[PDB]
């Protein structure tokens, strides 16, 4: 029921994955930096994570080829509406070919929700790509599986 995210260079982040082999920690490569995504009902394993509660989910986080984060800043007063709005998003996407998982992540240390989708490939995500409570513009970051 929790997700911890941290960012940094892939070479460094791999040292974290290696230390915690029992943990479900995904490493993916983005444009600004690489990302670790740790799904767990327990404690973080990172210094200074971004911490989240999983408020919606379909699918398991395993070995996706590709990850998409929609980073959506939301006013404090807007959180009920936003969560209500976006707990009607898993139902359409989950039938798309190559969809692996979705998480809707309520942020515990910021105003920025994350809608996380995992995909077999970037191509699968792009096929789907044909388908005020907000304090700042939202933005999407994408990440590829690392070897």
mmCIF file of C-alpha atoms in Angstrom:
data_model
loop_
_atom_site.group_PDB
_atom_site.id
_atom_site.type_symbol
_atom_site.label_atom_id
_atom_site.label_comp_id
_atom_site.label_asym_id
_atom_site.label_seq_id
_atom_site.Cartn_x
_atom_site.Cartn_y
_atom_site.Cartn_z
ATOM 1 C CA UNK A 1 0.000 0.000 0.000
ATOM 2 C CA UNK A 2 2.998 2.427 -0.106
ATOM 3 C CA UNK A 3 5.307 3.593 -2.956
ATOM 4 C CA UNK A 4 8.674 5.258 -2.371
ATOM 5 C CA UNK A 5 10.339 6.984 -5.281
ATOM 6 C CA UNK A 6 13.831 8.464 -5.528
ATOM 7 C CA UNK A 7 15.776 9.866 -8.492
ATOM 8 C CA UNK A 8 19.432 9.945 -9.485
ATOM 9 C CA UNK A 9 22.010 8.359 -11.775
ATOM 10 C CA UNK A 10 21.254 4.827 -12.849
ATOM 11 C CA UNK A 11 24.745 3.656 -11.808
ATOM 12 C CA UNK A 12 24.206 4.882 -8.270
ATOM 13 C CA UNK A 13 20.610 3.768 -8.002
ATOM 14 C CA UNK A 14 21.640 0.202 -8.941
ATOM 15 C CA UNK A 15 23.681 0.038 -5.731
ATOM 16 C CA UNK A 16 20.435 0.513 -3.778
ATOM 17 C CA UNK A 17 18.581 -2.200 -5.725
ATOM 18 C CA UNK A 18 21.505 -4.520 -5.081
ATOM 19 C CA UNK A 19 21.442 -3.927 -1.277
ATOM 20 C CA UNK A 20 17.747 -4.848 -0.930
ATOM 21 C CA UNK A 21 17.136 -7.993 -3.075
ATOM 22 C CA UNK A 22 13.920 -9.010 -1.256
ATOM 23 C CA UNK A 23 12.318 -5.625 -1.962
ATOM 24 C CA UNK A 24 10.268 -4.891 -5.080
ATOM 25 C CA UNK A 25 12.406 -2.055 -6.435
ATOM 26 C CA UNK A 26 12.184 -1.089 -10.074
ATOM 27 C CA UNK A 27 14.960 0.874 -11.838
ATOM 28 C CA UNK A 28 14.002 2.799 -14.998
ATOM 29 C CA UNK A 29 15.912 5.439 -17.069
ATOM 30 C CA UNK A 30 14.423 8.879 -17.735
ATOM 31 C CA UNK A 31 15.502 12.044 -19.505
ATOM 32 C CA UNK A 32 16.536 14.068 -16.490
ATOM 33 C CA UNK A 33 17.740 11.091 -14.420
ATOM 34 C CA UNK A 34 16.810 7.539 -13.544
ATOM 35 C CA UNK A 35 14.159 6.555 -11.022
ATOM 36 C CA UNK A 36 13.666 3.870 -8.380
ATOM 37 C CA UNK A 37 10.118 2.809 -7.631
ATOM 38 C CA UNK A 38 9.645 0.759 -4.488
ATOM 39 C CA UNK A 39 6.217 -0.750 -3.789
ATOM 40 C CA UNK A 40 5.841 -1.995 -0.210
ATOM 41 C CA UNK A 41 3.478 -2.198 2.748
ATOM 42 C CA UNK A 42 6.477 -1.444 5.005
ATOM 43 C CA UNK A 43 9.326 1.072 5.462
ATOM 44 C CA UNK A 44 11.357 3.005 2.913
ATOM 45 C CA UNK A 45 14.837 1.887 2.052
ATOM 46 C CA UNK A 46 15.932 5.280 0.596
ATOM 47 C CA UNK A 47 17.402 8.371 2.222
ATOM 48 C CA UNK A 48 14.931 11.177 1.434
ATOM 49 C CA UNK A 49 12.304 9.365 -0.651
ATOM 50 C CA UNK A 50 9.215 10.854 -2.131
ATOM 51 C CA UNK A 51 6.617 8.888 -0.189
ATOM 52 C CA UNK A 52 3.166 7.888 -1.412
ATOM 53 C CA UNK A 53 0.043 5.984 -0.449
ATOM 54 C CA UNK A 54 -1.368 3.729 -3.145
ATOM 55 C CA UNK A 55 -4.984 4.820 -3.512
ATOM 56 C CA UNK A 56 -5.726 2.872 -6.693
ATOM 57 C CA UNK A 57 -4.083 -0.090 -8.374
ATOM 58 C CA UNK A 58 -4.400 -2.703 -11.103
ATOM 59 C CA UNK A 59 -1.633 -5.081 -12.047
ATOM 60 C CA UNK A 60 1.664 -6.032 -10.515
ATOM 61 C CA UNK A 61 4.900 -4.152 -10.712
ATOM 62 C CA UNK A 62 7.303 -6.725 -12.143
ATOM 63 C CA UNK A 63 9.685 -6.116 -15.054
ATOM 64 C CA UNK A 64 7.953 -3.509 -17.236
ATOM 65 C CA UNK A 65 9.740 -2.273 -20.347
ATOM 66 C CA UNK A 66 8.489 1.267 -19.855
ATOM 67 C CA UNK A 67 7.057 3.554 -17.145
ATOM 68 C CA UNK A 68 5.000 6.739 -17.401
ATOM 69 C CA UNK A 69 4.433 9.221 -14.543
ATOM 70 C CA UNK A 70 1.953 11.979 -14.782
ATOM 71 C CA UNK A 71 3.048 14.493 -12.173
ATOM 72 C CA UNK A 72 -0.024 16.490 -11.237
ATOM 73 C CA UNK A 73 0.193 19.281 -8.639
ATOM 74 C CA UNK A 74 -3.030 19.712 -6.699
ATOM 75 C CA UNK A 75 -4.078 22.283 -4.125
ATOM 76 C CA UNK A 76 -4.626 21.017 -0.555
ATOM 77 C CA UNK A 77 -8.398 21.743 -0.860
ATOM 78 C CA UNK A 78 -8.491 19.997 -4.219
ATOM 79 C CA UNK A 79 -7.345 16.567 -3.032
ATOM 80 C CA UNK A 80 -10.784 14.989 -2.440
ATOM 81 C CA UNK A 81 -11.964 16.044 -5.917
ATOM 82 C CA UNK A 82 -8.760 14.979 -7.609
ATOM 83 C CA UNK A 83 -8.769 11.521 -5.955
ATOM 84 C CA UNK A 84 -12.428 11.048 -6.833
ATOM 85 C CA UNK A 85 -11.716 12.125 -10.467
ATOM 86 C CA UNK A 86 -8.764 9.770 -10.895
ATOM 87 C CA UNK A 87 -10.169 6.656 -9.286
ATOM 88 C CA UNK A 88 -11.982 6.405 -12.626
ATOM 89 C CA UNK A 89 -8.871 5.926 -14.777
ATOM 90 C CA UNK A 90 -7.671 2.349 -14.235
ATOM 91 C CA UNK A 91 -10.841 0.900 -15.906
ATOM 92 C CA UNK A 92 -10.172 2.072 -19.463
ATOM 93 C CA UNK A 93 -6.368 1.757 -19.598
ATOM 94 C CA UNK A 94 -6.181 -1.740 -18.064
ATOM 95 C CA UNK A 95 -7.505 -3.454 -21.252
ATOM 96 C CA UNK A 96 -4.936 -1.852 -23.543
ATOM 97 C CA UNK A 97 -2.512 -4.259 -25.201
ATOM 98 C CA UNK A 98 0.804 -4.296 -23.325
ATOM 99 C CA UNK A 99 -0.540 -2.461 -20.275
ATOM 100 C CA UNK A 100 1.130 -3.912 -17.141
ATOM 101 C CA UNK A 101 0.024 -1.912 -14.107
ATOM 102 C CA UNK A 102 -1.337 1.329 -12.826
ATOM 103 C CA UNK A 103 -0.869 3.087 -9.473
ATOM 104 C CA UNK A 104 -2.555 6.279 -8.332
ATOM 105 C CA UNK A 105 -0.191 7.693 -5.726
ATOM 106 C CA UNK A 106 -1.254 10.232 -3.094
ATOM 107 C CA UNK A 107 1.806 12.193 -2.063
ATOM 108 C CA UNK A 108 2.642 12.346 1.620
ATOM 109 C CA UNK A 109 5.400 14.959 1.508
ATOM 110 C CA UNK A 110 4.215 17.161 -1.393
ATOM 111 C CA UNK A 111 1.229 18.494 -3.379
ATOM 112 C CA UNK A 112 2.113 16.466 -6.495
ATOM 113 C CA UNK A 113 0.157 13.325 -7.227
ATOM 114 C CA UNK A 114 1.663 10.694 -9.498
ATOM 115 C CA UNK A 115 -0.343 8.537 -11.838
ATOM 116 C CA UNK A 116 2.030 5.720 -12.650
ATOM 117 C CA UNK A 117 1.475 3.410 -15.603
ATOM 118 C CA UNK A 118 3.697 0.458 -16.522
ATOM 119 C CA UNK A 119 3.911 -0.988 -20.001
ATOM 120 C CA UNK A 120 5.476 -3.875 -21.819
ATOM 121 C CA UNK A 121 7.045 -1.408 -24.275
ATOM 122 C CA UNK A 122 7.086 2.332 -25.150
ATOM 123 C CA UNK A 123 5.221 1.376 -28.331
ATOM 124 C CA UNK A 124 2.336 -0.046 -26.243
ATOM 125 C CA UNK A 125 2.106 3.207 -24.289
ATOM 126 C CA UNK A 126 2.145 5.276 -27.501
ATOM 127 C CA UNK A 127 -0.716 3.170 -28.963
ATOM 128 C CA UNK A 128 -2.750 4.106 -25.901
ATOM 129 C CA UNK A 129 -1.642 7.768 -26.352
ATOM 130 C CA UNK A 130 -4.595 8.016 -28.771
ATOM 131 C CA UNK A 131 -6.999 7.850 -25.760
ATOM 132 C CA UNK A 132 -8.933 25.203 -10.215
ATOM 133 C CA UNK A 133 -7.708 22.226 -8.172
ATOM 134 C CA UNK A 134 -4.310 22.310 -10.012
ATOM 135 C CA UNK A 135 -1.814 24.691 -8.483
ATOM 136 C CA UNK A 136 0.848 24.322 -11.268
ATOM 137 C CA UNK A 137 0.950 22.676 -14.724
ATOM 138 C CA UNK A 138 1.070 18.901 -14.687
ATOM 139 C CA UNK A 139 3.787 17.139 -16.683
ATOM 140 C CA UNK A 140 4.573 13.606 -17.821
ATOM 141 C CA UNK A 141 7.889 11.884 -17.394
ATOM 142 C CA UNK A 142 8.787 8.604 -19.116
ATOM 143 C CA UNK A 143 11.339 5.967 -18.217
ATOM 144 C CA UNK A 144 12.779 2.891 -19.908
ATOM 145 C CA UNK A 145 13.862 -0.443 -18.381
ATOM 146 C CA UNK A 146 17.574 -0.608 -17.573
ATOM 147 C CA UNK A 147 19.770 -3.680 -18.377
#
